[PDB]
Structure formats: structure tokens, C-alpha cells
């Protein structure tokens, strides 16, 4: 008689369980943590509010936390990223989850509130796992009393970590956090290689367009932009890259990309005349990867080649001025998460009009919106870090300190390199790779221990 | 964890305390923990299923958890009724590891504990490795469960007495699986057996009696590695130490080490009569310690002749070094406290509470350092147990049980670890002290005919 959930179709649970069993074989770091810590139950007593894409991969994470003793209440951190069969499997296992593919904004907020509230009253939560900072923001803004009992936050992604550091500098952060994003086995695995796998995957599922021989513009060349550019280049696209960071621009050049700006001489003054109309007129596909605001703006959208695809793989949809397109242009749904946007007018469209753009996932995270996000074996690294971070913060029991002691432990930290390496070793073994062991004299020669850590904390990999 | 009941210990609530001491012990065992860290990634014991029978101390806890960390499953018991530290056993069971051990077992409970490791859910466990200290588990397997040895890849034997039993089986063709003699690594024998007893013999006598040792007379029976370490344990406290030996080379060492070499028997001739006892000698001895691994070296006539209120103890592996059976049959036992009895020579039935004619027996004649104290310290057992881990990996990887008969015939032996591995254990022990070993120049290594990496001595070297 379990009813504390809300999913699209509970009967998809058996299908979801089949895929969870497969995914478990693809996630050895996470399943190794489950085996190593199951008997010790290091999360016994933890009550975790979780807000992250309700995919099959997140399901393995959820059941790993539960296997270690935790109770959880879960929601997705995006309206399009849930895999309904994963949510169904988690609900059928008796775990409160509120998540389905294609939520409205109102339903998105309701789902988070259903994790926060149990039977109309605040749940006695004491841990937070977030991806992007929406749950974190709601707790600080609307439920500050609940944070008095919460031992910490473990934050998944770059945008969320940015919001956390903003609150820390403004003195508004109420509990300590661990930056899961900046582990090497997260940032340089998930953010880069994950988008390499899943960006062309989403574009093919949404459009079935040939990419070889076509022109792409990738806005940004951080980790997500690096992986995105590779996702397209390996398919044979001619890829151009835009950046505001000269060091990232240098890497793009050395990686074999032409570096261009959508604006003449890189200067974005807000006018149509600043747009490089000749450049945008040749682009078949534009992808935003920045985590910034309005990096594919209304003047760029007006100037893009007819029938160009437009998508975003950064965390929030405001990378693209989709508001401008809702106000001025007529939307034709091809299928879910795929819209033709007719630049001929707002009121109606000719079904055979040739002047349209194709928008994927209404400008929300395209890899999760139009495909299934990152594959299990990549998320294995990110989610082993999440499990380790949850254990660390829960065992430190920040909320039980006196007021004076909380002030001294309020911080945003990363996991130590030794744990990063141990996650990486399990990932390598999952590939069948064999790591060499240093001899004692070789370890002394480079000044490390035989068991690591093998690099100083300044090393960039 | 939840549902785990596959153990038997004195008091599971001691586990937190045991964990605290295991965490300290890890800081004292650099060679063993270096192996745990070195081999953790490879998991060289994955699939190993180890029957283990050795004193269930804190130090054995670090060894057990190292084996598990390297991939093994284990089922464990103590090799002596009085040697278990109950907090170590508790910590191991609380970790979900099957262990049957507590301080103060009866002889029946002892045999029950070994059988609980051998059997799982009423049937022979599918074990494939044996770690033993003294040969009791090895003897039970060969005599009672011979079919289980068809699946076991080897035995790693800890101590002198157990190795002698193995070689007797090899000589008679009754040994069914190969063994590694862990005892005769130099980082075991000339560390554990000698310096271990130097630390822990006077330790156990003080805990049991709180007797001043300085200025009093001691008789140490034997001058092997344990006898050497025991004699130093007492001499360094200021005892006047006399040594008995049947081996004239060991006797020569005693003399040169500054001890008077004497015999309990006139002219060393033990004809079993009372008249052969050097009564004047034994009448001046305040403490006698057996160290031989032999039988009845402190016999009934010696016990009858000992100075009143003398302390009697054994630090060899088995209690039959002392004729305690004679004392149980003829003399009244007064328990002072656990593992400390006054043996009243006035008769069997009852005793006067203020009688002066008694002896003090420690640990009822069982290994006194472990019975009345905690045995060897962690930093010494570090060497012995690093050897144990190396010996387990080597025999498990050789996979004797899986070889054809002709390949078994070439491997059925009792061997020691290579000197190079002995040296690598020693090196970590030295670094644990802050010692700095010098590296040979190439010219120097050529001059004495060795590699810069070692081994530095021929296999004949005695150290
Ligand atoms: N979709 C996914 O699966 C996924 C995975 C990881 C992260 N993310 C999200 O993607 C975003 C980027 O993450 P990241 O780790 O790459 O961050 P990052 O800081 O490494 O990279 C962002 C890059 O954008 C550049 N940039 C900023 N403004 C720009 C502009 N106007 N024009 C061009 N370039 C500009 C920056 O110089 C920077 O190099 C974040 O929102 C993050 O949360 C998404
Ligand atoms: N209690 C401990 O912590 C501990 C540690 C290591 C070994 N042991 C045990 O102690 C015993 C001795 O071990 P070891 O390594 O010293 O062996 P060992 O061979 O080096 O020494 C035993 C000595 O006893 C002598 N001896 C034999 N019979 C004698 C007799 N009747 N009178 C006098 N001397 C006699 C022998 O000549 C020999 O030198 C064995 O049972 C061994 O397993 C105990
Ligand atoms: N498959 C996935 N599950 C959860 N979070 C993700 N972020 C990117 N891919 C993801
Ligand atoms: N402390 C100890 N632990 C295990 N075996 C031992 N043998 C002698 N002392 C010992
Ligand atoms: K996926
Ligand atoms: K000890």
C-alpha cells in the first residue's frame, strides 16, 4: 500500500528494473561502494532530499544511498530529463519520487515541494543532494528552519557550485557543501566525455539529421564545450568555436577548430549590425555550452541559416533567447521536445514554409531532453563521488554543533585526491585496464607514495 | 552488520574499544600495512577462503583485516585457550568476520572453536588456504577432514613447533598440501621469537605477580630464539639468570652472553630419580621459565625441589613443558586471580590460606606472554605477519590443489620465503624506526659481489 510518489506510469517499473540491473553492471565504482559500505551502514539515519535528473543512472545512485542506510525523497532537476521507466522502478521499490518527462514549470516546483513536505509537514530531512541549486535555493528561501537540521549539501554541477559560492560570499549559505563537480572523475569525465557521448546522440534522436559535412557553431569551450565540439567533430561536422576565455580559445585552436565570434570583432553591443550575418548565415547547428545568459541571442537567431538546428546543453534554458522566439515566432511541434520555429510571424504558419529553425528540448538540456543523458559507465564516476560526499558530510554532523562551531566549519570543499584516484581506479578496471604499480625507488624518485596521491593538488590533468 | 551471527566471542560490546586499539596497531605495523596498501588494487587473494588458527590478539586483527582487504574470506579461531584478547575478537566479529575465540576457553571449547571455522552451516566449508600457529588446525584437517585437503592450496605455518610437525609429516609422506615455513624468515624468527619474548616475558610476569625481578635468581630452560629473548627479558631487569641447554652451541652462546650454564640434574643426567636433582641449585631459584618446545623440561622432581614461593611459567607453545599434570594430581590449587594460581605442596585436599610452601604457576602453564599479558607488541608482530601475507599470496597463486599429479609432486614441500622478500619486510620495519639504510655504490656492490638491490647475503648466512 505504497502511495507516496508521483510518476507518469507505474507499470513501466519492470522495464525500469531490467535497465537498472544492466546499468549496475556498467557502474563498478558505485557498485563497489555499495558492496564495501553495505554492512557498515554509514548512512543509517540520513534523510536525503535529492534533486537530480531522474534517469536510470540516478536510480542506481538512489538505491546505493538506500543500501547504505539512507531514507530519501527524490525529484528531478529538469522538466524533460526524467526517464519514466526509471522513476517507475524507484516508486515501485517503495521510494518517494516525484518526477516525469515533460513536467510544466508549476509541476516542477510541486515535485520539489513534495520531497520537502511529508503529509503536508516538513520532512525531518538532514542531508541534501542537488544538481543545479534549485532545491538548495528553495530551502534557503522558503524553508530556512529545515536547514537548522541539515548536515550539508552535495552539489553535482558547475552552475550549482557557482550559486553556492555566491551564497558563501554573501554570508547567506546556512550549511556546508561539497563541490562534487570539481573531482577529476566528475568534471573531466562527466562534463567533457559525457557530452561527447550524448550530444550527437540527442541531435540524431530529435532530427535524424546527417551531421557529416555540415557547419556547427559551439558557444563555449569549457569542459562541456570541449566534449560537445568533439561530439560533433567526430561525426565529421565542420566545427567553429566561440569563447570569451582566451585560454579556452587557445585550446580550441590547438585542437583543430576555427575560433569565431557571432559578433563583429567580438563586440556585442546589442544591435543587429554587430552580428556577423555572413558567418551565422552558414551555420547548420548551434549549441550553447556556457552556463551564462543569452549567449545565443535574438539577433543571432534572426541571422541563422534557414532550417538550422538550435540547442543548449548548459544547465539552464536562458542560454538561448527562447523568450524572444515565444513572443515573435510561431511554434510547430514536430514531436515531443522538437519544435520548428517559423520566423515568418507569430500568428500561424505555412506548413511548407522554408524559413524556420529547429529547436530541441525547448532549449533545455538537450542531451537529457532528447536522449538519455550521459551513459551509466560515465555517471559511475560522478555518482561514486556523490556517495562519498554524502557519507563525509553526514558523518561530520555539522547541524549538531553549537552556534560557535558551525561558523568555523561553514565552507564549500572538494573531496581529497586520494578518493578521486580510488574512484578512477575502479573505472579503469571496468574497462579492463591494468594500472602499473611504482617500485619503491620509482616512488622516491618522483616524491610520491606507492599508493598515491600521485599528483599535487595544483595538477590540472 | 545486520543478521550476522556467525561468530562466538566473550562480549560483542567490546568491539568499539577493539577498533580503537586496531587503529593504533595499524600505526605500529608499517610492513603489514604497506602490503595492505601495496596489494589493495590487485586483490591478490580474491577467491581465497582461509582457515585461520592463531592467537586472536589485536595484532592478529590487523593481519586478518589485511587478508580480507586483499580479497580473502576467512574463518578464524585462536590457537591457545588463554591468548585471545576479547576486544580484538569483538572488533573482528563486529566487522562481519567469523571468529570463534575468547580468553579462558576450556579444552572442549577450544576444539569446538576450530571446528566452527572448519564447518559452515553443518558442512565442510569450501576452504582453500590454511594459516596455522602450532599445527593444531593442520592436524585436525589431516586426521578428521582429509577430504577437505583435496581443495586446499597450502598452509602457512607461524611457529617453530608447527614447522617441526609439518616436517615430520613430510618425512613420513603424510603431508597432503605444501607449506611455507613462516617461522624461519629472519624478520620472523630473529624478531618475533627473540625480541618478542624479550618485551613480553617480564611484562607477563609483572602483570601476573607484580614481583620485583631485580636481584632474584632465574632459571631459563633453553637458549634457542625464545630462550635467548627470555633470558634478556630477565637479565635486563636485573635478575641473576642461569641457563640450561641440551645444545652445546646454544650453551656456548649463553656463556659468551654472560650467563652461567647449569643443569637441573647432577652432571646433566636426568635418570628420573629424585637423587639426580641438583636440590641445592633448584632450592635457590625464584623463577623458572621453559622455552624449549620439548616435553617435561620442568619435571615433577624439579617442581618438588624448587625454592618455596618460586614462580613457574612456560613461554614455549605447549603447556606440556611443565609437568602440570603432576601438580593437579598431588597439590592443591589456589586461584589468586585469572591465570595466576598458588600451588600448595602440602597436599591435595585443601590448603592453609597462610601456607608458605607453595609455587606460583602462571597461565596454568600455557604461553605466559599471551596468557598473562598481550604477547608480542604490534611493531614486532608486524614482521611475522607481513611474512604471513606474502606466504598466503604465494601459495594461493601457485594453486597446488588445481595442479596435475606430476606437478604436485614437484611442489609438495615445506619452504621459506625468498631472502629478497625477507629483506623487503626488514626494510619497512627499519623505516618505521626512522632508520636510514645506506645504498651501495655500483663499485661497492661489485666489490662484494651483490646487486645494489640485494639480496645482500648468501642463503647460508645466519645473521
Ligand atoms: N548537459 C549536461 O549533461 C551537463 C554536464 C555538465 C555540466 N553541464 C552544465 O553546462 C554548463 C557548462 O559547464 P562547464 O563545466 O563546461 O563549465 P565551464 O566553466 O568549464 O565552461 C563554460 C565556458 O563558457 C565560456 N563562456 C562564457 N560566456 C560565454 C559567451 N558569452 N560566449 C562564449 N563562451 C562563453 C567560458 O569562458 C567557459 O570556458 C553549466 O551550466 C553546467 O552546469 C551540463
Ligand atoms: N610464546 C611465544 O610468544 C613464542 C614465540 C615464538 C616461538 N614460541 C615457541 O617456543 C618454543 C621454542 O621456540 P624457538 O624458536 O626458541 O625454538 P628453538 O629450536 O630455537 O629453541 C629451543 C631450544 O630448547 C633447547 N632444549 C630442548 N630440549 C631441552 C631440554 N630438555 N633442556 C634444555 N634445553 C632444551 C634446544 O636445544 C633449543 O636450542 C616453540 O614451542 C615455539 O613454537 C613461542
Ligand atoms: N544520465 C544522467 N543521469 C543523471 N544526471 C545526468 N547528468 C548528465 N547525464 C545524466
Ligand atoms: N601478540 C601476538 N599476536 C599474535 N600472535 C602472537 N604470537 C606471539 N605474540 C603474539
Ligand atoms: K543514459
Ligand atoms: K600485544
PDB file of C-alpha atoms in Angstrom, chain B residues 48-281:
ATOM      1  CA  UNK B  48      40.936 -17.248  -1.193  1.00  0.00           C
ATOM      2  CA  UNK B  49      38.983 -18.959   1.596  1.00  0.00           C
ATOM      3  CA  UNK B  50      41.321 -19.172   4.576  1.00  0.00           C
ATOM      4  CA  UNK B  51      41.040 -21.306   7.695  1.00  0.00           C
ATOM      5  CA  UNK B  52      42.980 -19.343  10.308  1.00  0.00           C
ATOM      6  CA  UNK B  53      44.117 -20.601  13.728  1.00  0.00           C
ATOM      7  CA  UNK B  54      46.293 -18.150  15.673  1.00  0.00           C
ATOM      8  CA  UNK B  55      46.169 -16.170  18.951  1.00  0.00           C
ATOM      9  CA  UNK B  56      43.242 -13.770  18.471  1.00  0.00           C
ATOM     10  CA  UNK B  57      45.101 -10.624  19.572  1.00  0.00           C
ATOM     11  CA  UNK B  58      44.869  -7.051  18.319  1.00  0.00           C
ATOM     12  CA  UNK B  59      47.911  -7.870  16.160  1.00  0.00           C
ATOM     13  CA  UNK B  60      46.104 -10.827  14.580  1.00  0.00           C
ATOM     14  CA  UNK B  61      43.195  -8.449  13.948  1.00  0.00           C
ATOM     15  CA  UNK B  62      45.421  -6.302  11.731  1.00  0.00           C
ATOM     16  CA  UNK B  63      46.578  -9.448   9.889  1.00  0.00           C
ATOM     17  CA  UNK B  64      43.015 -10.742   9.441  1.00  0.00           C
ATOM     18  CA  UNK B  65      41.764  -7.422   8.090  1.00  0.00           C
ATOM     19  CA  UNK B  66      44.758  -7.152   5.753  1.00  0.00           C
ATOM     20  CA  UNK B  67      43.923 -10.562   4.253  1.00  0.00           C
ATOM     21  CA  UNK B  68      40.281  -9.519   3.832  1.00  0.00           C
ATOM     22  CA  UNK B  69      41.371  -6.197   2.308  1.00  0.00           C
ATOM     23  CA  UNK B  70      43.359  -8.210  -0.240  1.00  0.00           C
ATOM     24  CA  UNK B  71      40.270 -10.227  -1.263  1.00  0.00           C
ATOM     25  CA  UNK B  72      40.164 -13.225   1.107  1.00  0.00           C
ATOM     26  CA  UNK B  73      37.327 -14.660   3.123  1.00  0.00           C
ATOM     27  CA  UNK B  74      38.445 -16.093   6.463  1.00  0.00           C
ATOM     28  CA  UNK B  75      37.013 -18.129   9.347  1.00  0.00           C
ATOM     29  CA  UNK B  76      39.126 -17.727  12.468  1.00  0.00           C
ATOM     30  CA  UNK B  77      39.966 -19.265  15.838  1.00  0.00           C
ATOM     31  CA  UNK B  78      42.665 -18.853  18.467  1.00  0.00           C
ATOM     32  CA  UNK B  79      45.473 -21.366  18.776  1.00  0.00           C
ATOM     33  CA  UNK B  80      45.533 -21.144  22.588  1.00  0.00           C
ATOM     34  CA  UNK B  81      42.817 -21.146  25.259  1.00  0.00           C
ATOM     35  CA  UNK B  82      44.231 -18.072  27.095  1.00  0.00           C
ATOM     36  CA  UNK B  83      45.758 -15.934  24.317  1.00  0.00           C
ATOM     37  CA  UNK B  84      42.649 -14.204  22.917  1.00  0.00           C
ATOM     38  CA  UNK B  85      42.138 -10.506  23.619  1.00  0.00           C
ATOM     39  CA  UNK B  86      38.377 -10.260  23.933  1.00  0.00           C
ATOM     40  CA  UNK B  87      38.229  -6.744  22.478  1.00  0.00           C
ATOM     41  CA  UNK B  88      40.180  -7.863  19.377  1.00  0.00           C
ATOM     42  CA  UNK B  89      37.807 -10.803  18.853  1.00  0.00           C
ATOM     43  CA  UNK B  90      34.829  -8.492  19.344  1.00  0.00           C
ATOM     44  CA  UNK B  91      36.064  -5.975  16.769  1.00  0.00           C
ATOM     45  CA  UNK B  92      36.644  -8.738  14.205  1.00  0.00           C
ATOM     46  CA  UNK B  93      33.157 -10.223  14.681  1.00  0.00           C
ATOM     47  CA  UNK B  94      31.523  -6.771  14.615  1.00  0.00           C
ATOM     48  CA  UNK B  95      33.193  -6.340  11.215  1.00  0.00           C
ATOM     49  CA  UNK B  96      31.171  -9.322   9.929  1.00  0.00           C
ATOM     50  CA  UNK B  97      34.137 -11.746  10.060  1.00  0.00           C
ATOM     51  CA  UNK B  98      33.535 -15.244  11.519  1.00  0.00           C
ATOM     52  CA  UNK B  99      35.714 -15.697  14.613  1.00  0.00           C
ATOM     53  CA  UNK B 100      35.311 -18.188  17.473  1.00  0.00           C
ATOM     54  CA  UNK B 101      37.641 -17.155  20.296  1.00  0.00           C
ATOM     55  CA  UNK B 102      37.654 -15.871  23.868  1.00  0.00           C
ATOM     56  CA  UNK B 103      40.083 -15.679  26.759  1.00  0.00           C
ATOM     57  CA  UNK B 104      39.794 -18.649  29.092  1.00  0.00           C
ATOM     58  CA  UNK B 105      38.372 -21.403  26.885  1.00  0.00           C
ATOM     59  CA  UNK B 106      38.101 -24.936  28.186  1.00  0.00           C
ATOM     60  CA  UNK B 107      39.838 -27.626  26.136  1.00  0.00           C
ATOM     61  CA  UNK B 108      36.405 -28.627  24.816  1.00  0.00           C
ATOM     62  CA  UNK B 109      35.536 -25.057  23.825  1.00  0.00           C
ATOM     63  CA  UNK B 110      38.921 -24.744  22.092  1.00  0.00           C
ATOM     64  CA  UNK B 111      38.262 -27.772  19.862  1.00  0.00           C
ATOM     65  CA  UNK B 112      34.710 -26.539  19.248  1.00  0.00           C
ATOM     66  CA  UNK B 113      36.103 -23.198  18.010  1.00  0.00           C
ATOM     67  CA  UNK B 114      38.427 -24.780  15.422  1.00  0.00           C
ATOM     68  CA  UNK B 115      35.548 -26.968  14.211  1.00  0.00           C
ATOM     69  CA  UNK B 116      33.322 -23.890  13.853  1.00  0.00           C
ATOM     70  CA  UNK B 117      35.850 -22.475  11.394  1.00  0.00           C
ATOM     71  CA  UNK B 118      36.094 -25.812   9.521  1.00  0.00           C
ATOM     72  CA  UNK B 119      32.304 -26.218   9.250  1.00  0.00           C
ATOM     73  CA  UNK B 120      29.810 -23.716   7.851  1.00  0.00           C
ATOM     74  CA  UNK B 121      26.098 -24.482   8.201  1.00  0.00           C
ATOM     75  CA  UNK B 122      26.944 -28.014   9.309  1.00  0.00           C
ATOM     76  CA  UNK B 123      29.071 -28.928   6.271  1.00  0.00           C
ATOM     77  CA  UNK B 124      32.779 -28.531   5.480  1.00  0.00           C
ATOM     78  CA  UNK B 125      33.439 -25.003   4.296  1.00  0.00           C
ATOM     79  CA  UNK B 126      34.916 -24.782   0.791  1.00  0.00           C
ATOM     80  CA  UNK B 127      38.225 -23.538   2.226  1.00  0.00           C
ATOM     81  CA  UNK B 128      41.329 -23.448   0.065  1.00  0.00           C
ATOM     82  CA  UNK B 129      44.016 -21.927   2.335  1.00  0.00           C
ATOM     83  CA  UNK B 130      45.249 -22.591   5.873  1.00  0.00           C
ATOM     84  CA  UNK B 131      47.077 -20.177   8.175  1.00  0.00           C
ATOM     85  CA  UNK B 132      48.197 -22.005  11.310  1.00  0.00           C
ATOM     86  CA  UNK B 133      50.188 -21.327  14.510  1.00  0.00           C
ATOM     87  CA  UNK B 134      51.305 -24.565  16.190  1.00  0.00           C
ATOM     88  CA  UNK B 135      49.826 -27.153  13.810  1.00  0.00           C
ATOM     89  CA  UNK B 136      46.548 -27.908  15.630  1.00  0.00           C
ATOM     90  CA  UNK B 137      44.294 -26.892  12.736  1.00  0.00           C
ATOM     91  CA  UNK B 138      46.639 -28.698  10.331  1.00  0.00           C
ATOM     92  CA  UNK B 139      46.454 -31.853  12.470  1.00  0.00           C
ATOM     93  CA  UNK B 140      42.634 -31.742  12.691  1.00  0.00           C
ATOM     94  CA  UNK B 141      42.325 -31.359   8.902  1.00  0.00           C
ATOM     95  CA  UNK B 142      44.651 -34.265   8.099  1.00  0.00           C
ATOM     96  CA  UNK B 143      43.140 -36.578  10.723  1.00  0.00           C
ATOM     97  CA  UNK B 144      39.455 -35.624  10.791  1.00  0.00           C
ATOM     98  CA  UNK B 145      38.712 -33.859   7.463  1.00  0.00           C
ATOM     99  CA  UNK B 146      41.250 -35.311   4.996  1.00  0.00           C
ATOM    100  CA  UNK B 147      38.857 -34.833   2.080  1.00  0.00           C
ATOM    101  CA  UNK B 148      38.968 -31.040   2.631  1.00  0.00           C
ATOM    102  CA  UNK B 149      42.701 -31.022   1.895  1.00  0.00           C
ATOM    103  CA  UNK B 150      41.929 -32.021  -1.709  1.00  0.00           C
ATOM    104  CA  UNK B 151      40.847 -28.396  -2.284  1.00  0.00           C
ATOM    105  CA  UNK B 152      43.440 -26.533  -0.159  1.00  0.00           C
ATOM    106  CA  UNK B 153      46.368 -24.874  -1.939  1.00  0.00           C
ATOM    107  CA  UNK B 154      48.712 -24.640   1.045  1.00  0.00           C
ATOM    108  CA  UNK B 155      49.451 -23.979   4.703  1.00  0.00           C
ATOM    109  CA  UNK B 156      51.405 -21.028   6.083  1.00  0.00           C
ATOM    110  CA  UNK B 157      52.769 -22.062   9.493  1.00  0.00           C
ATOM    111  CA  UNK B 158      53.764 -19.464  12.085  1.00  0.00           C
ATOM    112  CA  UNK B 159      55.880 -21.119  14.734  1.00  0.00           C
ATOM    113  CA  UNK B 160      58.780 -23.481  15.415  1.00  0.00           C
ATOM    114  CA  UNK B 161      56.606 -26.225  16.922  1.00  0.00           C
ATOM    115  CA  UNK B 162      54.180 -26.210  13.995  1.00  0.00           C
ATOM    116  CA  UNK B 163      57.044 -26.384  11.493  1.00  0.00           C
ATOM    117  CA  UNK B 164      58.522 -29.419  13.235  1.00  0.00           C
ATOM    118  CA  UNK B 165      55.148 -31.182  12.954  1.00  0.00           C
ATOM    119  CA  UNK B 166      54.978 -30.352   9.215  1.00  0.00           C
ATOM    120  CA  UNK B 167      58.468 -31.748   8.562  1.00  0.00           C
ATOM    121  CA  UNK B 168      57.565 -34.901  10.462  1.00  0.00           C
ATOM    122  CA  UNK B 169      54.536 -35.291   8.183  1.00  0.00           C
ATOM    123  CA  UNK B 170      56.650 -34.601   5.100  1.00  0.00           C
ATOM    124  CA  UNK B 171      59.243 -37.168   6.227  1.00  0.00           C
ATOM    125  CA  UNK B 172      56.506 -39.788   6.705  1.00  0.00           C
ATOM    126  CA  UNK B 173      54.720 -38.946   3.452  1.00  0.00           C
ATOM    127  CA  UNK B 174      51.553 -37.932   5.344  1.00  0.00           C
ATOM    128  CA  UNK B 175      51.628 -34.221   4.457  1.00  0.00           C
ATOM    129  CA  UNK B 176      48.877 -33.641   1.910  1.00  0.00           C
ATOM    130  CA  UNK B 177      49.461 -29.999   0.873  1.00  0.00           C
ATOM    131  CA  UNK B 178      52.540 -27.767   0.577  1.00  0.00           C
ATOM    132  CA  UNK B 179      53.534 -25.364   3.325  1.00  0.00           C
ATOM    133  CA  UNK B 180      55.533 -22.205   3.798  1.00  0.00           C
ATOM    134  CA  UNK B 181      57.662 -22.088   6.969  1.00  0.00           C
ATOM    135  CA  UNK B 182      56.921 -18.510   8.014  1.00  0.00           C
ATOM    136  CA  UNK B 183      58.864 -19.044  11.271  1.00  0.00           C
ATOM    137  CA  UNK B 184      62.289 -19.142   9.615  1.00  0.00           C
ATOM    138  CA  UNK B 185      62.140 -15.808   7.848  1.00  0.00           C
ATOM    139  CA  UNK B 186      64.770 -13.752   9.635  1.00  0.00           C
ATOM    140  CA  UNK B 187      62.167 -10.981  10.118  1.00  0.00           C
ATOM    141  CA  UNK B 188      60.128 -13.617  11.966  1.00  0.00           C
ATOM    142  CA  UNK B 189      62.459 -15.986  13.877  1.00  0.00           C
ATOM    143  CA  UNK B 190      65.103 -13.423  14.859  1.00  0.00           C
ATOM    144  CA  UNK B 191      62.500 -10.764  15.630  1.00  0.00           C
ATOM    145  CA  UNK B 192      59.284 -12.361  16.919  1.00  0.00           C
ATOM    146  CA  UNK B 193      60.778 -15.398  18.673  1.00  0.00           C
ATOM    147  CA  UNK B 194      63.658 -13.477  20.318  1.00  0.00           C
ATOM    148  CA  UNK B 195      62.848  -9.765  20.688  1.00  0.00           C
ATOM    149  CA  UNK B 196      59.150 -10.527  21.116  1.00  0.00           C
ATOM    150  CA  UNK B 197      59.870 -12.641  24.196  1.00  0.00           C
ATOM    151  CA  UNK B 198      62.325 -10.005  25.461  1.00  0.00           C
ATOM    152  CA  UNK B 199      59.471  -7.472  25.505  1.00  0.00           C
ATOM    153  CA  UNK B 200      56.640  -9.668  26.733  1.00  0.00           C
ATOM    154  CA  UNK B 201      58.100 -12.195  29.210  1.00  0.00           C
ATOM    155  CA  UNK B 202      58.924  -9.737  32.004  1.00  0.00           C
ATOM    156  CA  UNK B 203      55.699  -7.929  31.008  1.00  0.00           C
ATOM    157  CA  UNK B 204      53.595 -11.033  31.721  1.00  0.00           C
ATOM    158  CA  UNK B 205      55.423 -11.840  34.980  1.00  0.00           C
ATOM    159  CA  UNK B 206      54.828  -8.307  36.295  1.00  0.00           C
ATOM    160  CA  UNK B 207      51.147  -8.311  35.341  1.00  0.00           C
ATOM    161  CA  UNK B 208      50.588 -11.708  36.952  1.00  0.00           C
ATOM    162  CA  UNK B 209      52.598 -11.298  40.187  1.00  0.00           C
ATOM    163  CA  UNK B 210      53.902  -7.695  40.372  1.00  0.00           C
ATOM    164  CA  UNK B 211      57.078  -9.287  41.778  1.00  0.00           C
ATOM    165  CA  UNK B 212      60.296  -7.349  41.844  1.00  0.00           C
ATOM    166  CA  UNK B 213      62.633  -9.188  39.480  1.00  0.00           C
ATOM    167  CA  UNK B 214      65.910  -7.310  40.125  1.00  0.00           C
ATOM    168  CA  UNK B 215      68.274  -9.218  42.406  1.00  0.00           C
ATOM    169  CA  UNK B 216      66.378 -12.522  42.235  1.00  0.00           C
ATOM    170  CA  UNK B 217      67.506 -15.842  40.744  1.00  0.00           C
ATOM    171  CA  UNK B 218      66.085 -17.175  37.482  1.00  0.00           C
ATOM    172  CA  UNK B 219      66.497 -20.453  35.619  1.00  0.00           C
ATOM    173  CA  UNK B 220      65.712 -20.325  31.913  1.00  0.00           C
ATOM    174  CA  UNK B 221      65.364 -23.782  30.337  1.00  0.00           C
ATOM    175  CA  UNK B 222      66.558 -23.499  26.742  1.00  0.00           C
ATOM    176  CA  UNK B 223      68.558 -20.934  24.802  1.00  0.00           C
ATOM    177  CA  UNK B 224      67.114 -21.007  21.305  1.00  0.00           C
ATOM    178  CA  UNK B 225      65.478 -17.896  19.933  1.00  0.00           C
ATOM    179  CA  UNK B 226      62.806 -17.834  22.657  1.00  0.00           C
ATOM    180  CA  UNK B 227      65.315 -18.750  25.376  1.00  0.00           C
ATOM    181  CA  UNK B 228      67.715 -16.021  24.189  1.00  0.00           C
ATOM    182  CA  UNK B 229      64.952 -13.409  24.251  1.00  0.00           C
ATOM    183  CA  UNK B 230      63.567 -14.664  27.577  1.00  0.00           C
ATOM    184  CA  UNK B 231      66.998 -14.600  29.226  1.00  0.00           C
ATOM    185  CA  UNK B 232      67.466 -10.969  28.116  1.00  0.00           C
ATOM    186  CA  UNK B 233      63.944 -10.104  29.283  1.00  0.00           C
ATOM    187  CA  UNK B 234      65.006 -11.170  32.788  1.00  0.00           C
ATOM    188  CA  UNK B 235      68.673 -10.126  32.791  1.00  0.00           C
ATOM    189  CA  UNK B 236      67.819  -6.575  31.663  1.00  0.00           C
ATOM    190  CA  UNK B 237      65.500  -6.298  34.704  1.00  0.00           C
ATOM    191  CA  UNK B 238      68.453  -7.209  36.920  1.00  0.00           C
ATOM    192  CA  UNK B 239      67.720 -10.877  37.529  1.00  0.00           C
ATOM    193  CA  UNK B 240      70.635 -13.249  38.055  1.00  0.00           C
ATOM    194  CA  UNK B 241      69.948 -15.616  35.165  1.00  0.00           C
ATOM    195  CA  UNK B 242      71.194 -19.185  34.797  1.00  0.00           C
ATOM    196  CA  UNK B 243      70.540 -21.086  31.565  1.00  0.00           C
ATOM    197  CA  UNK B 244      70.013 -24.790  30.890  1.00  0.00           C
ATOM    198  CA  UNK B 245      70.569 -26.305  27.450  1.00  0.00           C
ATOM    199  CA  UNK B 246      70.969 -29.637  25.724  1.00  0.00           C
ATOM    200  CA  UNK B 247      72.571 -27.976  22.676  1.00  0.00           C
ATOM    201  CA  UNK B 248      76.242 -27.116  23.396  1.00  0.00           C
ATOM    202  CA  UNK B 249      76.350 -24.494  20.640  1.00  0.00           C
ATOM    203  CA  UNK B 250      73.414 -22.624  22.210  1.00  0.00           C
ATOM    204  CA  UNK B 251      75.082 -23.196  25.592  1.00  0.00           C
ATOM    205  CA  UNK B 252      78.281 -21.628  24.243  1.00  0.00           C
ATOM    206  CA  UNK B 253      76.259 -18.572  23.237  1.00  0.00           C
ATOM    207  CA  UNK B 254      74.739 -18.377  26.743  1.00  0.00           C
ATOM    208  CA  UNK B 255      78.214 -18.319  28.295  1.00  0.00           C
ATOM    209  CA  UNK B 256      79.590 -15.705  25.918  1.00  0.00           C
ATOM    210  CA  UNK B 257      76.397 -13.667  26.530  1.00  0.00           C
ATOM    211  CA  UNK B 258      77.373 -13.697  30.210  1.00  0.00           C
ATOM    212  CA  UNK B 259      75.128 -16.400  31.705  1.00  0.00           C
ATOM    213  CA  UNK B 260      76.115 -19.303  33.937  1.00  0.00           C
ATOM    214  CA  UNK B 261      75.080 -22.547  32.202  1.00  0.00           C
ATOM    215  CA  UNK B 262      73.679 -25.119  34.650  1.00  0.00           C
ATOM    216  CA  UNK B 263      71.595 -28.271  34.645  1.00  0.00           C
ATOM    217  CA  UNK B 264      68.647 -29.164  36.922  1.00  0.00           C
ATOM    218  CA  UNK B 265      70.263 -32.627  37.125  1.00  0.00           C
ATOM    219  CA  UNK B 266      73.621 -33.591  38.615  1.00  0.00           C
ATOM    220  CA  UNK B 267      76.149 -33.741  35.737  1.00  0.00           C
ATOM    221  CA  UNK B 268      73.214 -33.081  33.392  1.00  0.00           C
ATOM    222  CA  UNK B 269      71.980 -36.681  33.691  1.00  0.00           C
ATOM    223  CA  UNK B 270      68.198 -36.930  34.032  1.00  0.00           C
ATOM    224  CA  UNK B 271      67.618 -40.516  35.169  1.00  0.00           C
ATOM    225  CA  UNK B 272      64.140 -39.755  36.570  1.00  0.00           C
ATOM    226  CA  UNK B 273      65.163 -40.215  40.227  1.00  0.00           C
ATOM    227  CA  UNK B 274      64.945 -37.611  42.971  1.00  0.00           C
ATOM    228  CA  UNK B 275      68.619 -38.115  43.809  1.00  0.00           C
ATOM    229  CA  UNK B 276      69.581 -36.844  40.356  1.00  0.00           C
ATOM    230  CA  UNK B 277      68.066 -33.405  41.041  1.00  0.00           C
ATOM    231  CA  UNK B 278      70.537 -30.683  41.975  1.00  0.00           C
ATOM    232  CA  UNK B 279      68.456 -29.783  45.022  1.00  0.00           C
ATOM    233  CA  UNK B 280      70.889 -27.110  46.187  1.00  0.00           C
ATOM    234  CA  UNK B 281      70.532 -25.342  42.831  1.00  0.00           C
TER     235      UNK B 281
END
